[PDB]
Amino acid sequence: DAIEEKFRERLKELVVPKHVMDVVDEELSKLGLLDNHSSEFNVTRNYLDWLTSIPWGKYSNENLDLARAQAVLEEDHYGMEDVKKRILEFIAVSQLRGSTQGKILCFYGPPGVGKTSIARSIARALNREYFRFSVGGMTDVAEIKGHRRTYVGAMPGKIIQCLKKTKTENPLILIDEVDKIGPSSALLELLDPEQNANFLDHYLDVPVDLSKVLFICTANVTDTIPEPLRDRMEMINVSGYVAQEKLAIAER
Amino acid sequence: DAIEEKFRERLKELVVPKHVMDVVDEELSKLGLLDNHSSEFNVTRNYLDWLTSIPWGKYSNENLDLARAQAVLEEDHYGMEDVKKRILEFIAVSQLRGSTQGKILCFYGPPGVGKTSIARSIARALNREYFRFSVGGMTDVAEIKGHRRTYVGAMPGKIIQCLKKTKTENPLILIDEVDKIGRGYQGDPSSALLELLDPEQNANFLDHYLDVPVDLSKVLFICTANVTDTIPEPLRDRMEMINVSGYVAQEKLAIAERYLVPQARALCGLDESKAKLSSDVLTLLIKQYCRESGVRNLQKQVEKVLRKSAYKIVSGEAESVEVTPENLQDFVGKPVFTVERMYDVTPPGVVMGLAWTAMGGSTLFVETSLRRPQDKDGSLEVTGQLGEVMKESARIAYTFARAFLMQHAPANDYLVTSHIHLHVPEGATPKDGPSAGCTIVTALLSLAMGRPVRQNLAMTGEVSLTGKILPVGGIKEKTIAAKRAGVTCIVLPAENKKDFYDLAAFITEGLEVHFVEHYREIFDIAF
Amino acid sequence: YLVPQARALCGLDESKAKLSSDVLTLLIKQYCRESGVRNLQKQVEKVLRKSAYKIVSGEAESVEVTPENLQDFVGKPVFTVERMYDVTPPGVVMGLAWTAMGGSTLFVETSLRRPQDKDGSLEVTGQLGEVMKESARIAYTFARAFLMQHAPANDYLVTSHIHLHVPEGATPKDGPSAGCTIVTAL
Amino acid sequence: RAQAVLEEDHYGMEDVKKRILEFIAVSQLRGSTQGKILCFYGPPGVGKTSIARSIARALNREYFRFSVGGMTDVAEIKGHRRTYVGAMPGKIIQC
Ligand SMILES: Nc1ncnc2c1ncn2[C@@H]1O[C@H](COP(=O)(O)OP(=O)(O)OP(=O)(O)O)[C@@H](O)[C@H]1O
Ligand SMILES: Nc1ncnc2c1ncn2[C@@H]1O[C@H](COP(=O)(O)OP(=O)(O)OP(=O)(O)O)[C@@H](O)[C@H]1O
Ligand SMILES: Nc1ncnc2c1ncn2[C@@H]1O[C@H](COP(=O)(O)OP(=O)(O)OP(=O)(O)O)[C@@H](O)[C@H]1O
Ligand SMILES: [Mg+2]
Ligand SMILES: [Mg+2]
Ligand SMILES: [Mg+2]
């Protein structure tokens, strides 16, 4: 009985949308009619735990000051003009529209130029939560879409794991080595803005809103990405360093 | 016992069929005999709840007015005339008959043309409920069929959950990316889609969890696919496939300035007066940066320009941004497409051909040159990453060129003895297809006679061994490329007359066109 | 079966949209050339629904589907040319091939590669499969033998360089069914 | 009567109709309800699935459709042991 209150209290601070609240309270009503030792009770318990742990309507308080963000960006990296200009434009648009926004960037270039590090520094500068998602070598769609609740084991996929971990609806997600993927058709739904806002997971069975998630993909070569997947992303090039720039980086 | 009254109160509003009513009564009696705590009681209660909540015999109030439906369809998408005509025909047919109807459509075409969003616009126009079922990459057939009640956590499936969620028995189901369906180890989902999308068997679609047929004959299924040939033939036979073609630059300008720019302004918050994107700027941007058939990169370019202007304004660098064709490169960067014609004046050995490419049409030049000083027999060497079909076409062209030159100018032994080398520039780009046969024949003959072809003539078409010109595909892209490159005269196979005249009026206004049945006509035209 | 059922589904009385036997024959021979039936049903449904839209929108009160204006209802014909050569020049022979979209015909084309008519040679093109190339070699040998015995003085096949082509070079073709056609062409 | 019933629904499938008429003749020579197993194979859209209902009408037999396409569960064929909570005898026994 106390588990019902434990699930209920998680929704006090959240702003649960209507179509999610209906599922939540129908499972609440269902749970009272099952004995504790039954397996259906266990699966309903897990489903309620997953539904009530999603940060519905929780947004990290981003900083929209161009000066402070620029000072942070130069503090960590040297001479990556294109990425810094892109982030400044992102912050400018967010400030002008008065609300947070999501974008799909793709930093591609030779290894060792600092793509992962600049992504971490961007997450720190924007005051967003950060999460690594290594797609390199992934071969099963279950990592992104999960399995049905019927199976003994079940996952809501790595994206819902990120949502639970970061406790925010607008984190910064690093999807690295998109050119070394095995499969890719699950990523289209994840990062297609026409359906990104209603990403549906096979375990949750309820669509979550990922339109505010800032996806930052990194790759080494651009031709290996499938054309439909390459079409949905903004390709930003990170160039190699000349000897003078390498000397400056080493000194600083 | 009160739960039985609840189930009755939920059923009695519905037009339940006889067999469903019998099953519900049987399970109600079975639940009545069971106690309140047994697991079988919980299973029976959940099954009867699933049977109850499904909307038997109730339909959404579908709209039947042609004018407002056409307006709603026009609010969101431009130029998708085939889909709009299909929807209007659907509405007219549903209006003539007394009841709503369901069909199985499939929109296919290149990416970024609007197949996904047009589904939503159609659902809004028809006033039907909308559901997006993304089967791309899916491999679990249980998503379509589900599991029996014997299993611990069985659920019906995606379609039955759609019916429960929408509370209507005639929703709009978008089976997104049906061509990307996964032939995995856990069954074959396409084999289940065969019966899900069977026009006759939809009335008796049977779900494993329910074990009761469900009438899906009024559900409107829309499938989206980028490529057709990968869909299984039994499944491809059931669907009514209609093509969503790409957009020409004339259409892309209207699409941009009517939909993309206002939406991008709303997203970025900029006013019209703060940053103006004039029509000429958009035309230049489309010409030099957005040659593809999709509209998902023009949108990115427009967003880039607008976000750069927004950063310029908010940082205080300026109160307004004046985008001009001169300074556009400062916002969008380096132009991508600059040169459209490699040869301004053609030397004797070259002929300007046409080619089909993904990013609009293209023009290729067939280059020939003598390889050894003296004009045992002659031989031909081909380079330029030609495919096997292109190599066979080159061999046939060489044989016919020899025959034609022997018949026309018996004293000219150039093609019989000389060692020829044929090359197609842009050697890094592979190329295939028999469309260049007549181009190769003309190149060989012009080299042999030492006469350059007409300075603005482009030709395409397969050539047989006896000189007949055969029809070729990709007429639209080739015509667009020829018009772009300043071609004034174009030669096409005579069997492509229907394909050429079906093009839009503004695409073929300035082109002199000759239709040929045999190569001698092309020879008379070129020289 | 299909026309009455489509009329019942679309609600059009026979007097509102006439579909004669000749227009159905033309539609079948131009568009519905496969072995199944579903495509024919879809074409009939398209014609009837277009007539229904014409009637509803007030454009007309009666629709006549003549053989001339069937293109306005269905679009571009899919099959138009039945044979490539109306009269065969000396070097070609008409053949027959199996295809999924009903039967089809192929022409075997031969011509000289060098002017003089040392040993002769045969070049085979047309995306022919291994089996049909092997049959072409067999046909070349048998044609040599047959012309040796029939007309001893004819040295054409023995010394001339011959190119043999089967048109529609983009279409892959295979099978030994064309051996006699190749022999007769040579 | 069986030939008339078969003709009014489908056209031109002479082999299947002849097979059904032979089945009726054999079932008529010996007074028993004969049962056989038949497989219909061919290109899509020829009338395999549809002819089933017409044959059932001609034979005056009950008709049931059991589509196994994409099915991976043997429990549909064989059911489950009655020890389990929600065991059911499978599709054939329910038919
Ligand atoms: N401009 C820079 N200023 C300072 N340090 C830099 C700069 N560019 C790269 N580095 C450093 O170089 C290293 C590169 O590590 P990192 O993992 O970010 O590289 P990467 O190119 O993104 O890698 P990969 O392609 O393997 O994912 C880090 O130690 C990073 O701090
Ligand atoms: N004719 C058009 N008029 C207006 N906007 C259009 C048009 N065509 C495409 N768009 C816009 O371009 C984008 C294309 O997205 P959408 O998902 O609809 O494309 P798609 O070709 O169906 O994609 P995919 O096949 O990869 O799923 C959307 O923002 C859509 O609004
Ligand atoms: N001989 C026929 N006479 C009349 N209608 C026919 C005939 N053959 C097929 N049809 C009709 O054509 C359609 C074919 O549907 P059907 O279910 O019979 O397909 P099928 O041949 O079994 O194909 P699949 O292999 O795709 O399941 C139905 O509408 C059926 O009524
Ligand atoms: Mg990395
Ligand atoms: Mg889509
Ligand atoms: Mg069938």
From Swiss-Prot, chain B:
Tissue: Duodenum, heart, lung and liver, but not thymus.
Keywords, in A-Z order: ATP-binding, Cataract, Deafness, Disease variant, DNA-binding, Dwarfism, Hydrolase, Mitochondrion, Nucleotide-binding, Protease, Serine protease, Transit peptide
EC class of the enzyme, as a word: hydrolase
One GO BP annotation of this record: mitochondrial protein catabolic process
Effect on the protein upon substituting G473P: Has normal basal, but low stimulated ATPase activity, and abolishes peptidase activity
EC number, UniProt record: 3.4.21.53
Description of its domains: The Lon N-terminal domains are crucial for the overall structure of the protein, maintaining it in a conformation allowing its proper functioning.
Protein name: Lon protease homolog, mitochondrial
Organism: Homo sapiens
Source lineage: Eukaryota, Metazoa, Chordata, Craniata, Vertebrata
UniProtKB/Swiss-Prot annotation, chain C:
Domain of life: Eukaryota
Location relative to the cell: Mitochondrion matrix
Free-text domain note: The Lon N-terminal domains are crucial for the overall structure of the protein, maintaining it in a conformation allowing its proper functioning. The AP-domain (ATP-binding and proteolytic domains) has a closed-ring conformation in the presence of AMP-PNP and its N-terminal entry gate appears closed. Upon ADP binding, it switches to a lock-washer conformation and its N-terminal gate opens.
Quaternary structure, from the entry: Homohexamer. Organized in a ring with a central cavity. The ATP-binding and proteolytic domains (AP-domain) form a hexameric chamber, while the N-terminal domain is arranged as a trimer of dimers. DNA and RNA binding is stimulated by substrate and inhibited by ATP binding. Interacts with TWNK and mitochondrial DNA polymerase subunit POLG.
Known function: ATP-dependent serine protease that mediates the selective degradation of misfolded, unassembled or oxidatively damaged polypeptides as well as certain short-lived regulatory proteins in the mitochondrial matrix. Endogenous substrates include mitochondrial steroidogenic acute regulatory (StAR) protein, DELE1, helicase Twinkle (TWNK) and the large ribosomal subunit protein MRPL32/bL32m. MRPL32/bL32m is protected from degradation by LONP1 when it is bound to a nucleic acid (RNA), but TWNK is not. May also have a chaperone function in the assembly of inner membrane protein complexes.
Family: Belongs to the peptidase S16 family.
Descriptive protein name: Lon protease homolog, mitochondrial
Whole-protein coverage range: 673 to 864 of 959
